[PDB]
C-alpha cells in the first residue's frame, strides 16, 4: 500500500438523474375539442393506454412493454 | 433416506448449533444447557436454565417465539418441534452458569477479585469438591497477565476429568479488550447417582463386626 496514481483517465463520470424536465405528458392541445394521443401506444396490452412509446430514429421503443417493441411506422 | 453415519453426525451438528443459538440469546437467563429427545411424531427440546420465568415470558410468549425461530430455521413441520423450560438444580455445580454470572458481574463493573471470590465461595458452598476460576487479560495494565483463584481440590489427569470436572470458558468484552474467564468445578463423586461414586484409587475397607469367642461346644436342635 503506497498510493493510487490512477493511470486510468479522469473518469469520475457519474450519470444523469433521469433528466429533470418541465411538465410532461403531452397528449395534445385542442381549443373546445377533444385531445388525441401522440406517441401511439404499444400493441402489447401489458403496456396499454398509459405508456408513451418512444420514437428515437428508425424504430420505436417501450418501457412498460420492457425494452423491446421495435416497429417502423 | 440417509445413511446412519451421516444421520448421527447430522443430529450431532444440530445439537451443537442449537446449543450455540441458545447460549447466544439466553445468556442473561442463566442458560445452563439443552437436551434433545426424538419421539415418534414429536421432538422435544429441554432447556435447562435458572430463570425459567424469563425464559417463558407472559403465557410462554418467549417460548412460542423460540419454537417458531428453531422451526423456521430447521424446517420443521407445525407441531413436530416443542420446547420446554426447566429449572436446573445445583446452580453452583454448573460451570456455564457460574462463568456467565461472572461475565455479567465484570461487565457491570465488579472488581475481578471480588467477582472471582464470590463465584468460588458460591461453588464451594454449593457442595463442590473444588472450584477454580482463572481470569486472563489486560488487568489494570497494558501488559496482560493471568490470575487464579482456587478453593478445595481439583484433579487434572485421567478419566475422572471427564467424569467429575465441569469446565466453561467465556469472553468478556471490556473497553480495553477481551478478558478470558475459565471456570472449573470438581463435584463430589459421592453425590453422583449416575456412574462411579468414588475416585478410582479410593479403597474402602468395611469394619469387621466383632463376635465374642464361644469356648464351648454346643448343639441347637429343632
Amino acid at each position: 500500500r503506497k498510493k493510487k496514481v490512477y493511470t486510468t483517465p479522469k473518469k469520475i463520470k457519474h450519470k444523469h438523474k433521469k433528466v429533470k424536465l418541465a411538465v410532461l405528458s403531452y397528449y395534445k392541445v385542442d381549443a373546445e375539442g377533444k385531445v388525441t394521443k401522440l406517441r401511439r401506444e404499444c400493441s402489447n396490452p401489458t403496456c396499454g393506454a398509459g405508456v408513451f412509446l418512444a420514437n428515437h430514429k428508425d424504430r420505436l421503443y417501450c418501457g412498460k412493454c420492457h425494452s423491446v417493441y421495435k416497429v417502423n411506422a | 433416506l440417509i445413511s446412519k453415519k451421516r444421520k448421527l453426525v447430522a443430529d450431532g451438528v444440530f445439537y451443537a448449533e442449537l446449543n450455540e443459538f441458545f447460549t447466544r440469546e439466553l445468556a442473561e437467563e442463566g442458560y445452563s444447557g439443552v437436551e434433545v429427545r426424538v419421539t415418534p411424531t414429536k421432538t422435544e427440546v429441554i432447556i435447562r436454565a435458572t430463570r425459567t420465568q424469563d425464559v417463558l415470558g407472559e403465557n410462554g410468549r418467549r417460548i412460542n417465539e423460540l419454537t417458531l425461530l428453531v422451526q423456521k430455521r430447521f424446517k420443521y413441520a407445525p407441531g413436530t418441534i416443542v420446547l420446554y423450560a426447566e429449572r436446573v438444580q445445583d446452580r453452583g455445580l454448573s460451570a456455564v452458569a457460574q462463568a456467565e454470572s461472572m461475565k455479567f458481574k465484570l461487565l457491570n463493573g465488579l472488581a475481578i477479585r471480588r467477582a472471582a471470590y464470590g463465584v468460588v465461595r458460591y461453588v464451594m458452598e454449593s457442595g463442590a469438591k473444588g472450584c477454580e476460576v482463572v481470569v486472563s487479560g489486560k488487568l489494570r495494565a497494558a501488559r496482560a497477565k493471568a490470575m487464579k483463584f482456587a478453593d478445595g481440590f481439583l484433579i487434572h489427569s485421567g478419566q475422572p476429568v471427564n467424569d467429575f470436572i465441569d469446565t466453561a470458558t467465556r469472553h468478556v468484552l471490556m473497553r480495553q479488550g477481551v478478558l478470558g474467564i475459565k471456570v472449573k468445578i470438581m463435584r463430589d463423586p459421592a453425590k453422583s447417582r449416575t456412574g462411579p461414586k468414588a475416585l478410582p484409587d479410593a479403597v474402602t475397607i468395611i469394619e469387621p463386626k466383632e463376635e465374642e469367642p464361644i469356648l464351648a461346644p454346643s448343639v441347637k436342635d429343632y
Partner: protein, 92 residues
Amino acid sequence: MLMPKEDRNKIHQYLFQEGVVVAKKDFNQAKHEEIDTKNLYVIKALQSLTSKGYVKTQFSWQYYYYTLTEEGVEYLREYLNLPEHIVPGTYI
C-alpha cells in the same frame, strides 16, 4: 435501501403474522424461503427495522434470527393498517 413498496410490504406482513423471521446470511440468493422476495431485501429491511428499535437480531451460525418488539408490533399494526389487537404473533 431501494426496494419496491409491495415486497417491502410482503416482508412486513410476514413479520407481523409469524412474529419471527430467519434469514440466512447469503446475499444474492434472490429468493428467501417462506417469502417470495430476495434474501438481500429481507435482510436489509429487517436491519432498517432493527435500527429503529422495532425488531431484535441474533446472528448464530450465519442465519439472522429476527423477533419484533412491542414497539415494533404497534408500528407494524399502524403501518399495515390493522385494528388494535387484531392478530399479532402472540396467540396463546
